[PDB]
From a paper:
A 60-kDa FAD-dependent oxidoreductase, [name] allosterically switches between two distinct redox states. NADH binding by the oxidized [name] monomer reduces its FAD cofactor at a centralized active site, allosterically disrupting hydrogen bond networks to release a 50-residue surface loop (C-loop) and stimulate dimerization at the [name] surface. Oxidized NAD+ and reduced FADH– form a long-lived charge-transfer complex (CTC), which stabilizes and maintains the reduced dimeric state of [name]. NADH-activated [name] dimers support import of OXPHOS subunits by CHCHD4 and are critical for [name] function.
To understand how SAXS CX1 and CX2 chemotypes engage [name] and enable dimerization, we crystallized select fragment hits with the [name] dimer-permissive mutant and wild-type [name]. Crystal structures of the [name] mutant bound to CX1 fragments and the underlying 4-aminoquinoline (4AQ) scaffold revealed that these scaffolds localize to the NADH active site, mirroring the native NADH ligand, as do CX1 and CX2 scaffolds bound to the wild-type protein. In all four [name] structures, the CX1 quinoline core aromatically pairs with the [name] FAD cofactor, positioning the primary amine to hydrogen bond with the E314 side-chain carboxylate and the W483 backbone carbonyl. To accommodate this amine interaction, the aromatic side chain of F482 must rotate out of the binding site. In [name] structures with NADH and CX1 fragments, the released H454 imidazole ring is well positioned to aromatically contact and retain the displaced phenylalanine ring of F482, thus allowing access to W483 and E314 contact sites. Halogen substitutions at positions 7 and 8 (fragments C12, D1 and D3) optimally accelerate dimerization. By contrast, the complementary chlorine-substituted analogs D3 and D1 with slower kVR rates do not make analogous halogen-π contacts, presumably from steric restriction of the larger chlorine atom. They still form optimal amine hydrogen bonds with the active site, and the aromatic edge at positions 2 and 3 is aligned to form edge contacts with F482 and H454 aromatic rings. When the [name]([name]) mutant is co-incubated with CX1 fragments, the oxidized mutant fully dimerizes and remains dimeric throughout the time series, similar to the wild-type [name]–NADH–DMSO control. The ability of the CX1 chemotype to shift the dimer-permissive [name] mutant toward the dimeric state also implicates F482 displacement and H454–F482 pairing in allosterically stabilizing the [name] dimer.
Residue numbers in the entry:
A (entry chain A): 129 to 509, 561 to 611
B (entry chain B): 127 to 195, 199 to 509, 561 to 611, 615 to 617
The structure:
């Protein structure tokens, strides 16, 4: 299309939430999503969890899964019939939402409210949302290695990554995961379950002393590492990769402490790099501390440009400047951007929550500023709650195997109350 | 009496506010603009307070507040240009009203409302924060007694010019603490006045020379000699340790062995941005440069802009900055007013600053001017200083070269990597490289 009122750059979780937010407040809105991926907007969490614990051997083709409730759903937010074609977008009665897949915005002209695509096309907009997300980081050791090593290394984020790694797990006998965060630990439990049926091997190495060493306190991180080992995973904590090479066709990971790991494939889950390529041509400011596009409390960068999702470094009126990489955050920030793109002028207020499932026995939700560096107070009874403190106020909460009580945690963070006894606060989560 | 509602609300009654009011009115001929000023005076420009008003021939200059540039007043406009705040929502085609002697003490961004120090509440449709900044003080003078604090002057407002002018006619020794442009301008002003009364003027600062933070050492040293020849006792490399009163006179004890006895002290040691309203308003402050953090359009939130000294903004060409120049307050205020009327345009036109150290020394500058940056100077009495970063000119200082600032502005905008800066110097009519 030559011109479109609402232009959403990127076809991920934040863009879809913004589109349906715009449509809700402007029933006749014409919204164009431009996505470099060939897929329609879809959610990613199932790519490292539900899709691996499915009984259907065609799950790689159907891309459907059963939720905690039990109802089956697809990873796509909506079926193709819910969208309109970009050709019909500036004609169809009552407008709609179109997705232009396989196209990447490569130049942003803020002055003329115009974007240029990788095929030379130019599109003008009235209001634009940057929801480009981010790219998985790689390891310098794997970068210094040859093509043989890189060709046997997976960066997990997209649907293709799930289908390729699922295919690898059925072809090799040993897969090593590098990274102790949520993604690395979830893929370990997933491959561990998948490995128990074929008798294969799953290794996980990371620099910390336990899984989520940057997020959970030491004692809980250590307890988690044992739960992951119970899933059939060989966990190698305190491991820093010095170099990676190929010897006799097998991958050989040399660690800084002298240890060596022989494996067939490597999955690198070592953080995310925000896609801020369009800031150069667009003259958009990026945040040197947190990375990403720097935006205000309303997720706004310029008069008619907002940013949401993983790529948005925003100002939290309550918690300070932040950048968050959570699914619910992309939904909340995307939804908020769409509202502000229709005159709402609302600041980021409703905090988002993140969750993670390390097998069917372990599952944690969380909200706010969750960092192992901050002081923590853990109350337990298999079940517990972790409070994250700063200036004598609770700024982050982790709920360990406690569900359907996130609104309670959200209220504690908002009230900013100075609690004399957190043990009493733990009763709000049914801990006694 | 302030109206309960006003379309445009400008907080602060300084240079940035006035420029925004003119801008708003030029784009919305019926705009109703309310300025709220904690000062009792109408908006006025400050550069004359340290320069032209001291070199005036009129002995009534302290009363008239007029100077020759053509003669004009320090006020941007006479009271006739303004309407009253009470009649602002009734006058046909609106106008600009100034509510003096009132301070905004609370900012509710959610409800687009402010609260004044008297309890008055004013809602707005669009708002500009133009609060400027407060002069800093020295910890040594903060630890001193009331006698010292009573004999210390923080120079910024009209009252400071009138109080210091009367003191220069009553005491024998005035010491200026601060080697920046303000301290140097006041030294040349008091030195010119002291040569006629037989008094003394002292200027001390920690740097090796005047404007040591701005100009290269060789140019800062040359400037210190001209200030000295204006009849000033300049004391470089001076760090104050304590200040006290002895035998009715002020005694300044420096970190080294030197001691200075004087009658009055003038501190020109920088500015502190007035960001008090950021707490209640939930507005972000910049921890590096200070001030309110705003984007390239000077916007903080949907209906709140910030201009002037208090605005930490994003320069698409030069990076995040905060500038404390008169022309910047004009340019950034005019830009804010345009954006408050839908312009949606970024800070693009670079502001210039200038300084006159007597009638024989005149500096003009533009861009990122910092002595820490690598510099290249080309001279012929006159010269140009190029401030470099990434092999590109990011700042220019023009030494006794006038009516060529648009040329300097183009060099910085073009971002060209010049193979020879002597050829670039010829654009300023320079034909000694340092
Ligand atoms: C495997 C996996 C599991 C996860 N599990 C969880 C979980 O359990 N809980 C949780 O809270 N979070 C989870 N997350 C994080 C959550 O998925 C992310 O926060 C969320 O996907 C971010 O959405 P987004 O809109 O910000 O960006 P993205 O989802 O990254 O979407 C951006 C899209 O824009 C495209 N794009 C980028 N640049 C351009 C351009 N110039 N032009 C056009 N298109 C462009 C990108 O290709 C991508 O398609 C998981 C993430 C992954 C990868
Ligand atoms: C003596 C002097 C000489 C100078 N000479 C030069 C020069 O030669 N060249 C040059 O380039 N620059 C010069 N400057 C710098 C230039 O004057 C400043 O950059 C300019 O005045 C900045 O304007 P502003 O509108 O941002 O703020 P200000 O001029 O400080 O105006 C802010 C006003 O808002 C008021 N205010 C603050 N908070 C509130 C509140 N909550 N409610 C109501 N009112 C409030 C303050 O009292 C003040 O009256 C000089 C400055 C001084 C002090
Ligand atoms: N369970 C998760 C919680 C938060 N963030 C995540 C990011 C990734 Cl990439 C994968 C899983 C996550
Ligand atoms: N001549 C000046 C140039 C730039 N900035 C100045 C700031 C002050 Cl406070 C006083 C004079 C100045």
């Amino acid at each position: 299309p030559s011109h479109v009122p609402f232009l959403l750059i990127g076809g991920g979780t934040a863009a879809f939430a913004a589109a349906r937010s715009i449509r809700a407040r402007d029933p006749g809105a014409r919204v164009l999503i431009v996505s470099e991926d060939p897929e329609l907007p879809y959610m990613r969490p199932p790519l490292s969890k539900e899709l691996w614990f499915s009984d259907d051997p065609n799950v790689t083709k159907t891309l459907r899964f059963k939720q905690a409730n039990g109802k089956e759903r697809s990873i796509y937010f909506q079926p193709p019939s819910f969208y309109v074609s970009a050709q019909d977008l500036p004609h169809i009665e009552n407008g709609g939402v179109a997705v232009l897949t396989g196209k990447k915005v490569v130049q942003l002209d803020v002055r003329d409210n115009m974007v240029k695509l990788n095929d030379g096309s130019q599109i003008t907009y009235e209001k634009c949302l940057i929801a480009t997300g981010g790219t998985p980081r790689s390891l310098s050791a794997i970068d210094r290695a040859g093509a043989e090593v890189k060709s046997r290394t997976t960066l997990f984020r997209k649907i293709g990554d799930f289908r390729s790694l699922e295919k690898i797990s059925r072809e090799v006998k040993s897969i090593t995961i590098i990274g102790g965060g949520f993604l690395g630990s979830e893929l370990a439990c997933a491959l561990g379950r998948k490995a128990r049926a074929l008798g294969t091997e799953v290794i996980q190495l990371f620099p910390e002393k336990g899984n989520m060493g940057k997020i959970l306190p030491e004692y809980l991180s250590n307890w988690t590492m044992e739960k992951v080992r119970r899933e059939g995973v060989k966990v190698m904590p305190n491991a820093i990769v010095q170099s990676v090479g190929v010897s006799s066709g097998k991958l050989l990971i040399k660690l800084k402490d002298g240890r060596k790991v022989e494996t067939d494939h490597i999955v690198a889950a070592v953080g995310l790099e925000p896609n801020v390529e369009l800031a150069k041509t667009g003259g958009l400011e990026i945040d040197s501390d947190f990375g990403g596009f720097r935006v205000n409390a309303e997720l706004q960068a310029r008069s008619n440009i907002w940013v949401a999702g993983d790529a948005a470094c925003f100002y939290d009126i309550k918690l300070g400047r932040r950048r968050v990489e959570h699914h619910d955050h992309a939904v909340v920030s995307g939804r908020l951007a769409g509202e502000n793109m229709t005159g709402a002028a609302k600041p980021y207020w409703h905090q988002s929550m993140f969750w993670s499932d390390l097998g069917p026995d372990v599952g944690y939700e969380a909200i706010g500023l969750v960092d192992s560096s901050l002081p923590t107070v853990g109350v337990f009874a298999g079940k517990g709650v972790i409070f994250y403190l700063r200036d004598k106020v609770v700024v982050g909460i982790v709920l360990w195997n406690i569900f359907n009580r996130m609104p309670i945690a959200r209220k504690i963070i908002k009230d900013g109350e100075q609690h004399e006894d957190l043990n009493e606060v733990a009763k709000l989560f049914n801990i006694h």
